[PDB]
């Protein structure tokens, strides 16, 4: 006499009240660890986390008992769909912890792996802060080369065997969950089956990402062409005005953001951009003044004040005493009305705008706090960091800084400073989209099985050249796993999170400013003192995950899908300026070019029998003897012609454009100096003294 | 001059859980209501039928003081015509209720580090409570069609749940001590007046 939906509603009310408490104990144990790192707080975190996990997996199996088909209510269907999702609960105890063994291994190898300087083997540098300091600050071609190649050789090669068993187990897990692959498993974040109209497919995410990207590529090419022209003045002798950009000159280890190339590509370095760090320390600004003035910004747009529990339990300063703390900035929704922010706040402009960003996460958390426990999250995986970023966009404006006293009433922004601002934004916002687009498409192909493991790197670099316009400084065979050199890849983190969020920011931003009656360019808007904008924004923040993200997006923008047009509208003043700066330039890259094809030797392997006969048919270790044979020829050459004892090894012979069993190119570098490529005719001389060679 | 013992109800060191809400009958005494409404200690002093003022001028044949502890989110349910886990299953006030509902924050007293789980509330019941009815039942609630046999199981849940009272919760989840004064005028001698 009681319907199944009535049985699951009773079951969910039974789940909600202990899940809300067990999740509060796990976060409180994790919070006390993050603000006080000890050896008994780690176990308290691991104990409460294991108790919270074991309870969730227990209810997750009892949730599959209820058929999702016989439930016509919609808000209740979402809690089951989120609870009936096993995850890795579908695998054997053998395969599960072997999978956990790989993920833990890939994390420590990433966080503890080092790269040693070829000039001093005793100077072995970690990524943070060692290698990142080099890749984010240095302008030396060779210094960035050994750090770029070293990180991917010493540490990246160790992740290749781990990532191969990783892809196999995660796909094996996803297929048991009735998914296509692990990439299709990730794309279920955006999948929606509502009644009609507000639906969303998983294959549709593939189509929408590609459609938006070809609308971004025009803006990216002129930015790529401009940065290429400006780095010629920084790196002459190393880049060609027609080919791709070397991977180790893009501002960081992977080229994720081009922000650190701003001093080299500044449009008008004569004029500095707006920095309010000095204006704050002269005004006696402290950590509480930053958050209280950030609090007055959200209440000015119609959002509630911060809780008093937020001002007593949050840690907004680094402890003065002996207390090691994690203070990578995070916003915490512990539950039961407990919201705090953990941050080593300094009196700087960057820490000023991140405060508005992390407080934006808090306002989002407090809004959907009235929803059931299984619906207390963003509409999709990109709404949270997008809502926080539109707060810093309006807070960093000259209009807002003019109102809070950090910039004088005698302020006027000229034509050049906004070109400086929009480019520094483009190096961070526009420069990461092709990198974010290609990394996920690569992992989507690998999970799907479209790219075999014997061509993982050969395809990875073909798309960096074609999609991102970035070329390897040295060729990487199938012993490298360069994608795994990123934090999000070696730690099982989805990366399309940062691509859709970027589209979601300016989609929200343009819609909120038209409500605020903003006139002029979009990068000049400020939603401050606009109640009708924040309350319209608060309408979506209340929904959380109770409604499909196409519905939640339409409540704010008036459209149910990703629209890149607001993003291109945000950078139109710069896109208009880059085109006139690129008239006498090349817009685009030639995929053929490389920093080493200038001195490499084409080689055509002799097919002494029909192709397809493994009688001889050179393979990987026949290439090993070849690279050792040329290494021997280079040893005799320098010793007999130059009286120089130089220990060439197979690792000095780099093979590129390798088509197995048929053809390849190769060049030679000096030991300990991958920057020093041996001249080609000097190498061809060593081969003549001791297949086809084209010349 | 027998003043009504309001100190034993309000200043009590420990209150009862709402599913077993405690009631004390106050009779043939002198009630000063000035100590109650003129006090800034209470966050909620909503009165129905009666008024906060014009209360030392009336005479009732009894006065009942229902005292209990709920969360801050559920204090709004202590009112005529309200719906919720407290009003439906724990403590229901009639539609024509004549009296005062008094509540105040007690994070100082009823919350503890690690958790305070001594306060309980009924989560499941076959039907809604009638006004001023108390249910201290402990039978296993059967939501489905199979008998529970007195043990917790699938679609068979224990009806009474505990509150999680840590001092770090938001005020919505913090403990609130509630006192409900009901005024009684009958065919009776009109015990309690108060100048
Ligand atoms: C509680 O006791 C204090 C003294 O112990 C007294 O001043 C106060 O009036 C009492 N409150 C009530 C409501 O009886
Ligand atoms: Zn954030």
Residue numbers in the entry:
A (entry chain A): 18 to 707, 722 to 726
B (entry chain B): 333 to 527
Provide passages from the article that reported this PDB entry:
Herein, we show that dog angiotensin-converting enzyme 2 (dACE2) can bind to the SARS-CoV-2 spike (S) protein receptor binding domain (RBD), and that both pseudotyped and authentic SARS-CoV-2 can infect dACE2-expressing cells. RBD is responsible for receptor recognition, which had been mapped to the CTD in previous structural studies. dACE2 shares 83.88% primary sequence identity with hACE2. When infected with the authentic SARS-CoV-2, the number of copies of SARS-CoV-2 ORF1ab obviously increased in HeLa cells expressing either dACE2 or hACE2 at 48 and 72 h after infection, compared with that of cells not expressing these two molecules. These results confirm that dACE2 is indeed a cellular receptor that supports SARS-CoV-2 infecting host cells, similar to its human ortholog, hACE2. The architecture of dACE2 is also similar to that of hACE2 in the RBD/hACE2 complex: it is divided into the N-terminus and Zn2+ containing subdomain I, and C-terminus containing subdomain II15.
